Symmetry: C2
């Protein structure tokens, strides 16, 4: 598993400049803290965000998460750029404040990467209020992620909408402001050929 | 590979290299599977020295018996990906001197560093290694990896080849004397040359 090369790291550092260290910022993940498969970091004031995927180590756990949460396909993640999660988290500005829904797992994730400097705000919303704009967000911004193709069921075995880290970020922002974001454009600072493996290269 | 923080460290340390100064480069192992890299600046004694675990152990054990005499067990703790990172971090358009340019050229080109120029010094086989014994005597303490016995075509034993020593040997031959240096220094720290404590990489 070849991680980010030197040049890729320098590119990532440059691209991170497009993030406002002081602006409010959402973070959300799918998968457990020690084995995440999707990460999203969203700045609602200018539509700037970071979004990427990761191949899971525990395939047995991933199958369950898929069936009951994100509905992702392991086949789609095999081309994910290895080591991107550690690099991105390593590249985050010092002392940055991130907002989230359920900060237990994300805190463990940041700490595992020695980023105890990054602060987490648990915007504790009720499950009936947080998912109010679920349909509307998927409606307008669903084109940004097509990885959730599997069927997801709840306790009642009723088929429900899959969970996307990026959509969740926009969903939680909508609930916190009681309206969809007033944004002309949104933009992933990471390019496709950094999120996914590029052409083969000799790594030594 | 190298973590984000390690890469930022390597970038800072590389600042200790003068991009416009004379600089030797030498490797042990093939261009596609090297096991020792050395980059040496004769004017101030600053150098870069590190190791790599070989993919082809069969070819390695052959190189060991007839060239560098290194032990595969010593290389397991070598920081993975360090070779590509260092080469990626080298200043643009830098001029490197060496004795065996064809292999080093293929190495640099495989890393997309066509910008780096190589100077294959005019140097006779006998003249090139006149200072071999003197260099090892003075600087041998800098590398202890070459613990194995090495022989030529015949069963006659010979001194093993170190990438770092070779840089100092070739420099000595080029100026007809050992380097006039108060100090030499590896810009790379031990905890970056070898694996440090285990961290969660995702
Ligand atoms: Mg989520
Ligand atoms: Mg040599
Ligand atoms: Zn998604
Ligand atoms: Zn050596």
């Amino acid at each position: 598993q070849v991680g980010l090369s030197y040049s890729q790291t320098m590119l990532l550092k440059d691209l991170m400049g497009g993030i406002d260290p002081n602006a409010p910022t959402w973070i959300d993940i799918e998968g457990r803290f020690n084995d995440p498969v999707e990460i999203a970091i969203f700045q609602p004031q200018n539509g700037q965000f970071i979004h990427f995927y990761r191949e899971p180590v525990d395939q047995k756990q991933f199958k369950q998460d898929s069936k009951y949460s994100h509905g992702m396909d392991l086949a789609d993640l095999f081309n994910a750029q290895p080591g991107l999660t550690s690099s991105v988290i390593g590249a985050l500005p010092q002392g940055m404040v991130l907002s989230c829904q359920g900060s237990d797992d994300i805190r463990k994730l940041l700490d595992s990467q020695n980023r105890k400097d990054i602060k987490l705000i648990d915007v504790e919303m009720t499950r009936e209020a947080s998912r109010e704009y679920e349909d509307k967000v998927w409606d307008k911004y669903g084109w940004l992620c097509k990885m959730h193709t599997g069927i997801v069921r709840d306790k009642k075995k009723k088929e429900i909408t899959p969970h996307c880290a990026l959509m969740d970020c926009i969903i939680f922002e909508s609930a916190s402001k009681a309206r969809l974001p007033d944004l002309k454009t949104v933009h992933n600072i990471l390019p496709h050929d950094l999120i996914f493996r590029g052409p083969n290269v000799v790594t030594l």
